[PDB]
Subunit: 304 residues, 4 copies
Amino acid sequence: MTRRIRIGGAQMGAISRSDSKKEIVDRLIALLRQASEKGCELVVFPELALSTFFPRWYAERDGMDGYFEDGMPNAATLPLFEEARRLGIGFSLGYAELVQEDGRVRRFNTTVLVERNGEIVGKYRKIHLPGHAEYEPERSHQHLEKRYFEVGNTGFQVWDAFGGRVGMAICNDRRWVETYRVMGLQNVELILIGYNTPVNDPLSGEADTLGMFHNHLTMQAGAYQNSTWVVGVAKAGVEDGHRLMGGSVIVAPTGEIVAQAMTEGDELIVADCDLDLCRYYKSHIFNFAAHRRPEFYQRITSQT
Amino acid sequence: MTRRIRIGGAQMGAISRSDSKKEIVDRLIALLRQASEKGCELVVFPELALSTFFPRWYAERDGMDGYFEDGMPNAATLPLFEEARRLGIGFSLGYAELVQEDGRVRRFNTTVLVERNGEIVGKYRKIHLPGHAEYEPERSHQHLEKRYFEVGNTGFQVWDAFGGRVGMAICNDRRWVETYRVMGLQNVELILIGYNTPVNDPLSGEADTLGMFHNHLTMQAGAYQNSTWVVGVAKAGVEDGHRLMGGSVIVAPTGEIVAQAMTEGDELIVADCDLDLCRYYKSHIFNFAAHRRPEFYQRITSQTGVE
Amino acid sequence: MTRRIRIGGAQMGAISRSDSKKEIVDRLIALLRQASEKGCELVVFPELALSTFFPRWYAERDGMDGYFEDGMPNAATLPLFEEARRLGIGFSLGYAELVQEDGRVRRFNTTVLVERNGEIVGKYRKIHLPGHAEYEPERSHQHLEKRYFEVGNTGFQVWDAFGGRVGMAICNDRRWVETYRVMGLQNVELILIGYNTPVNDPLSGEADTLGMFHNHLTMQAGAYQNSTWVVGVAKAGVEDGHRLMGGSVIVAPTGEIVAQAMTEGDELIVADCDLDLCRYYKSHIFNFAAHRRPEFYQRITSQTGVE
Amino acid sequence: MTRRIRIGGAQMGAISRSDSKKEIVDRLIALLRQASEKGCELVVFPELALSTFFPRWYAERDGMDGYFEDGMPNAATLPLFEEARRLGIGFSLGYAELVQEDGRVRRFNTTVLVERNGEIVGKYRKIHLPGHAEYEPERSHQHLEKRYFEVGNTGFQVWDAFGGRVGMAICNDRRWVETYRVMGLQNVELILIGYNTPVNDPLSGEADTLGMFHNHLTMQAGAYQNSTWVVGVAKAGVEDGHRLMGGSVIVAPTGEIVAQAMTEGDELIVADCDLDLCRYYKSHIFNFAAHRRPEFYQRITSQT
């Protein structure tokens, strides 16, 4: 399915330890009305947008649940759904999902996708957990996503959404060619990726002069190599003495950046994304069929 | 120099269908000499570097063999092998392999890797063939590589060579994320990709402005996403009225471009390549613990096409 | 917000010499209505947006005038002025000016700046005419802009418009550093540069691979080195079998590109342009870290050519 | 080989306060032997190559004179020249020139251009002096070039050298379009620029994510808009807890980056540069005299 959709990249400034959830949620609602006054049918929020990036903070493995969410539409998060449904906007919202299964607690790094009528289209849970499970002393900053999260049971699902084929990856998911390719082989036309990337290297304690190089290099190639719109929205800023990288971008099926956010705070980038351009380029069978020969890709499934 | 090589990308200019072999090969020896004048240990030639791009010409499937190679070092291509052993320079060299194997003649888009002592390290046979096998008469130019080559039976091998782990791929293999991963998953540290990419669009008869963007884009993300050196050597220029893109690059395991050709002709670019950055960047994939999941990937190896 | 403008670049598809004026002007109006659906406060149109690129055509140095305008809002272009005022959108609009100034009949390559209330703020007349005065048979395509236009007598003016300071320049003006400097030295907050740039080089009849690279490069440094926004709007497409470059772009005062066009047809990009950033960077990137020493910059006015 | 010069960009690593000038001069001599053993005829050293970047340290205005130079072939630097002479290599060498005159003390940021036969082709002195003159506590790091240096009294001299037209500019000269334009109208074919660029912003003590962006964009467009080779060579590294960017590049008259350095340490980038390609572009359109209309450029001499 295919047509022409206006996406709002709703980049977020910092959130601190101090901030009340009401502030953060008003901050999302403000971006929402902005995308609304701009015709955006879909608006994309970042990873862990209801929170600070608490993986830089050491605590028992059940010591973060305050930052998590017991249900998706919450008392806390319910005005954000009322508004989105009232204005008839859909939104991808990254958050920290708290869920009970067999009587144990299960904690995922989740993004929920909600259709313009206000009803959930789905839920992705982060597959690639970066960081380390334990406290590692010789590092200027900490990254304990493994300590506070389990590998999601979702998989890389691509849904019939917003008049096209929509998929969702999360953050460092975007450095692995698998994330794009898996959703690719599903005819995905719109991959939504929210992200928090620290600006410095933890091993050296220094800034990665190549940080946005890599941030944009992985997404443009994904887009291009898979003929898919790719939307990357940042939570940037200095949270609690820790700077995150901005550079949110809407990327075309061809690899072209069409929208870039110049700040490290709340910023709504925006662009009209013909989903049908994707389906066209996917008709490369004309000449460059170069047809998938899975007989040779086998190593990708014994490891990767 | 803990494990460090001076690679040369010896990008080539045009080859007409009116060019003599000895011409083609003297040119190859020309660039091989150039490299020795710059202390190059490895030299990466282009794809199908002993012949014009005959995939743009129509003919019977067996009708192009006057271009192939009856053996890899033959009488024609022997002096290129001798002047490299003499100089102690390894090379990778792309050609059209004619071979009788499995009791019948076979035809591949091949690259051979020759180590400095003059000994063949490995062969790789192109997997991804683009284009069409029948004449498609609404395009400005024909891409008949499907008609003239068989898919390669090599796999994406990676070899102990030149002090590290060195694989090879050819042309539009550099469009497919798989090419790098598979090789990356054998601890590759250098990937030699020669190529021919017509500048004009086949179905538009007009240049792809994104021709070059896409060239360096896929190769740069490939170096990055597998912490591997990626050397891409073009054959470029107007060949019998068809212009081949240039842009030969040496790209570092950070994705950074460290050498670019600026001509569509015979040209050489040189960089020292620390094969150890690759080994180090792979074990700083620990804080960014992949702990990557091959269970979510199975779509990559199951279906050929797309659901 | 704080002196922010929602600017729209209205990149235009091709114009044949068969195209009616009603067609061209409706298309101009087409984009203007689009830009109102997106709440644009300014609409930057291309250069010579009221006719094709007749510099590619040989003719009497006075037998091009069916492409010129008798007056700036004329009976034909009147609708586009009306509909812009009726919606509250300012615009900048490139055209070919026929005026009986200094007694004689004078001909320029002009853009005009019109504000939201409907009132003309300024007019810039191209200073840098490229190409040649005469027919040049050894060039693949002709550029006769010197033969149909006189040098502009406006200077690089910078008016108070749209909440800040906005200047204008046209096409290959965006190549000469002088363009942004002069205008930036007048505290320009925003620069409108419409353009037609063929993709093929005139000697080779072959597309410059570094055609768009140069395009963005010269306009990005300009935005950067004068802490000014640079909105460059193309007319693009195959026009009567001549292809103009696309790549329209809004560049921020940092040098960053924040909106691009991916097509060579009628297309509109939008971006909120904080005119305050310009004045922020100006008193910081020109900190006491900058002092400009014009005693040494004296060749830029002394001579016109290299020595 | 002719109209064609093999340049080597001799990027340096850190020089800390605690180094001997014998360490430093050896490290430049080390680089010189690599350009010889790689074939270089001209080898370009960076700005302030004989000391740490002392303009980050507060002192009397004659206080940082131990980092300056008595005369150019010193006791300390005389081995660098003798070697360069033997290997028949010319070099650009940046340094803090101390020069006496009319009983007074004059102080410059100076690069000397030495020819392959060992003889000095000339000397440029920085015109564009960044930073401030007095101490300023509201910035995380200091620039006092204006305090310790004087505006140079050479201007952008272009000389005949290496079979071509060679000019010099220094460090943050490379941001001013006047640097390249002035030298281009002299038929410059090769602009040598050494530099030290702190990678944090002084005001915020934040890394300038655009730092290397900006570092390449000014030099590329300079090359292109003036049909010239532009060689840019850094001193990079952490000097006493202050970090300088790297990004040493040889740049074509097309504006194309043809060699780039990956480290923030001693690195020799090298490239073969047709000086005639300049004159091709210079006379294939891009004639200044044909389009230049300096009745309109007049503000460039009245204000800046």
